[PDB]
Amino acid sequence: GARVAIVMGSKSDWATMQFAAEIFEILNVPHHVEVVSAHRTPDKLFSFAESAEENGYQVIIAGAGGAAHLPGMIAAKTLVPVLGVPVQSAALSGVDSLYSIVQMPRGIPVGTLAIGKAGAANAALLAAQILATHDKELHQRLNDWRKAQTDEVLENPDPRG
Amino acid sequence: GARVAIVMGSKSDWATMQFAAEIFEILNVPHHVEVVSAHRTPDKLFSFAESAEENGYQVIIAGAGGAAHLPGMIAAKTLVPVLGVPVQSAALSGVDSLYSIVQMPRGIPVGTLAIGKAGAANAALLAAQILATHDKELHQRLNDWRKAQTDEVLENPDPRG
């Protein structure tokens, strides 16, 4: 039963959002992936948001670039926690994406992660850490993964050839 | 019949948007003023946008600050030209408002004006110029207003005491 949904504004955002899905495959977390555009498919955004709780979603990861309205508009139509990922734009290098997602007004929150693929991965890890509060097995797998990252750095202290 | 609607996300944006209305009072252009919140009242945003054409609007002036989603979400739900006004935010001084409104993707346009009260006035003036294309009287009133502004500067060339 998929407890987290990964949505994005364009299929072109998959370059970035695929990094969220990758973490879920490693940690073995069931998820739904879908393209929902705030500007090109506004009515689908509403229907999606309104039915998120019924479909069992406990966390939603939304990514978008430029005038990134996707994460914020989903959060306005549901009480399910929303995490936003700023996709790096061409002209402004993602600064516009970040400002559009992070500067939400009092009342409707969106947990924002880094700009780019690093943020997509982190959004996935954050959602996993949220689920892991009530999933001892996932909590254990997260623990092992984090130890693997640490150990890889510890067993390779010298960067020189 | 009001051909132009002035909307905003909060009653606190009125301190800025009131300058848009002041222009319409002077040019004698009927207008509707309303508070429509993209995040607090997402449903009303949809009904307002969907019925904008039937209600007779030919131009919509939407103001908002911070992660300003209001202008763009309206433009996504109607073919009525939308003009956005970035309200000056505390921390980022309206740069976040600007990027949220101006950086719209290909397909759903939003004509953006200056940050603050100057942009509010200009949104009204640009809307009046759009209407003036098919309104000879308004067109003439506009011409007279612009000559007044010009004349005022021409008859006060020395700024010194």
Added chain:
Amino acid sequence: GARVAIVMGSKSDWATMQFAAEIFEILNVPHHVEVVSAHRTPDKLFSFAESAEENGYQVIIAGAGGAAHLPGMIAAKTLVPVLGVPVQSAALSGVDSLYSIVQMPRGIPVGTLAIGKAGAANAALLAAQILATHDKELHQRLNDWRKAQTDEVLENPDPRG
């Protein structure tokens, strides 16, 4: 009878402005294209602006980069609505272009669109939406185009291979 004019500062801006012209070909909207430089051909800017109304232009789309004075100087010499498109500059990535076009003072408005090719396309769509207020046929073609974009996103929900 061409009702919208697309002007630019250099022939090098065509890389971007050609995206405005493209929308007009799809929507079958007659238009005039011309290179008018605010700094290299200032007298032509004036003559062009002064005669825009007589030549039947109802909307003007001006694009420029760096110290983008073109859109704002045209708006100062005519009551015909002007839409500005910030061309992406090398050093500042279009931030200088944006600030030059959007920060107009009270009295002379310029509707600004996104930085780059997305803004050029949008300026064309905005001008089309303005004309469509008094053109039931164009309004219908705009409607079909917008439905085509939406449907393309709806019939391709999964971004995965």
Added chain:
Amino acid sequence: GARVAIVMGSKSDWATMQFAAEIFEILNVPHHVEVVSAHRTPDKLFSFAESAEENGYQVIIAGAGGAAHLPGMIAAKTLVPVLGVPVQSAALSGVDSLYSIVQMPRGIPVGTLAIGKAGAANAALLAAQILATHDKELHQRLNDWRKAQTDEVLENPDPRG
């Protein structure tokens, strides 16, 4: 039992973080408030983080300004979801705070909220929504609070005098 901890780098950040606590008072959510400095008390930061799970916390809200290392260093020492709030700095207006919290590398996530008091309130709301996934009463209290905010705007449509 307090399921959420609110930490901050200085007692001077309380002017901002107090808005996070105000949300918990209204929603009736038990919380712990403490001053933990990443640079002045680095050892306490470690003990606090290491024992966060045993102490029963399911969400940590960390606020800080300038080179805001607090949120990230906590997230590095625990699997308990960390949400960061950038406190508005004097010179850079919170832009340095934002970048310090949001730009975390792949592996150690930190959900970032708006700059200032608005983000403090939203961190509390996001934390409450995370808990509300497994707390039907809190979930209902959240629903009621959000309807109150919506209703308030809907019954005050005209901002004018």
Added chain:
Amino acid sequence: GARVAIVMGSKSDWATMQFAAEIFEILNVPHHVEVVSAHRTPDKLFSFAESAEENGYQVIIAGAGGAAHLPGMIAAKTLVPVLGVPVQSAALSGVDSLYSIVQMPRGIPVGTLAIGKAGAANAALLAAQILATHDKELHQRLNDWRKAQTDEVLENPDPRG
């Protein structure tokens, strides 16, 4: 005969440009002061620029804020050296003024000075140095003024009480 002209877009810019004039009063350099608006009085801008040489000017100091088109449009209509002064704007703190003046394309130069009152003073000083190349008396008065500023700092080495 006044060899230097000081122009500005608004009488409100005088609060900044008055520091340029103060320098000329001290150095005893004849100057002309006038309000020339690029957007409100575009025709006067042209006449002023076209006749600058015949009127005997050898340097023009133009100040403006926001989308500061004034300096550049003057430089486009005359071969008389133009020096621009960015006036500090409210929202963007003169960054928009700076970019509008400094980022001129190849062909039409504008020597830009600091933002605000410091740049106004320096525009006057740079103009005086240009004239001083062919004015031995002014050259000497400049030397004396600069030694006075130096001497003042040298005879007050301790800033403490």
Added chain:
Amino acid sequence: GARVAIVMGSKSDWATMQFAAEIFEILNVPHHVEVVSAHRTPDKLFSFAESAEENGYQVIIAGAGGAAHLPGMIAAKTLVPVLGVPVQSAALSGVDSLYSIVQMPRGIPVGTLAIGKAGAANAALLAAQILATHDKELHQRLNDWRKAQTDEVLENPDPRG
């Protein structure tokens, strides 16, 4: 007799500064080119500045990148007008270069041009316009050059193939 000097901080700045020299070759203006480093050869900077007037220089064009101290330090040791050109840096895209040259304090002025090759060319044109005030022949050649640029734009109005 060379009346203008082109100096730079590194031989690597020639990629940009060569555009200043190019204008002088076209306009047939004698000039001196030299590498003077403010940080690597501080004593040579002083000797150069101190003897600029004796060597007959009437204008100095200095270019540098990053912490661009060259233009400002030359201006402090001479009354000969100094024009600064911000070389585009790698990390900050020339924003650091611009701020370092343009924000001079009251007393020591530096006329700043655009970032990059466009500014280098313009610095040369500005220096030429300064010399042309007392050189009827150069004034004529500048006039022809400007007409050639204008005419090239006028005889090529359509950017389309």
Added chain:
Amino acid sequence: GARVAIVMGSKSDWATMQFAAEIFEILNVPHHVEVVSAHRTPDKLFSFAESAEENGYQVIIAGAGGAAHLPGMIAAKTLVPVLGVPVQSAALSGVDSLYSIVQMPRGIPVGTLAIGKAGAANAALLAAQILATHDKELHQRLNDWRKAQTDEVLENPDPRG
């Protein structure tokens, strides 16, 4: 014997630099305070730097704002470690000060601290730590001061009323 010198460009920078001196008073470190202007007194800057070693200085703390050339020009004339403090400028809020000091090219280093009073205090502390490497008493006084700051935060965990 004073082993550390605190210089600044203006007596107006004292409002910031006084915090560097306050640290030395508390740690009982002999220091010299002086106003040395890079632009108004370029000759004194050279004599000061050249004789810094003979005068017994082992660390130099230089503060300046705007186009802050002071720190770098001193570092160019001496091998005595220079630490720079960016003074908060009006318009750009110290960003220009930061870039002028921090972006030094390869060869001539300048250790840069925070913008404003916080950086002034830290320059003093960093200087004291450098001296403390060969001064056991100062080293101990430093240890005691740091424990005092830590203890203060540890014995005031609750910021609330």
Added chain:
Amino acid sequence: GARVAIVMGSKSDWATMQFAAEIFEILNVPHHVEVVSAHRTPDKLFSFAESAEENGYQVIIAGAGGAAHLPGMIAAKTLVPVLGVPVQSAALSGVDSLYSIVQMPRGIPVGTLAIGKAGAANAALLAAQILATHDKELHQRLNDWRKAQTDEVLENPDPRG
């Protein structure tokens, strides 16, 4: 006996930090190189910092990118002077790296150098200048190196072919 330590957050930072090590090889200064991650290996950061003095380190050079917490967290656990080098990040071009390292609060100082390879080299030179205060031989080698850089610029004044 190695008196300076070069640490970094990833082995990917070696592309930049290798420029610090290069200066030390030229100047023949013994040094230790190691990968210490603030987020992936937080406990190693503490152990490293705590034992820096015992291992004889008199200066520590730490480099990191993005949310660069490494330099600041080391400085919090030791009195050994820390120098920070901002590694150039992809999205924000190192601006996030700079803000994360330089904006330390009062009490814990980190001497910051330029963004990129130029800062890495300079951090090494600054650490060498600190050691050279009590090493007449190193002081002499630094002196020769600096004269070699100056002379190379002096014997190649003309940048033209």
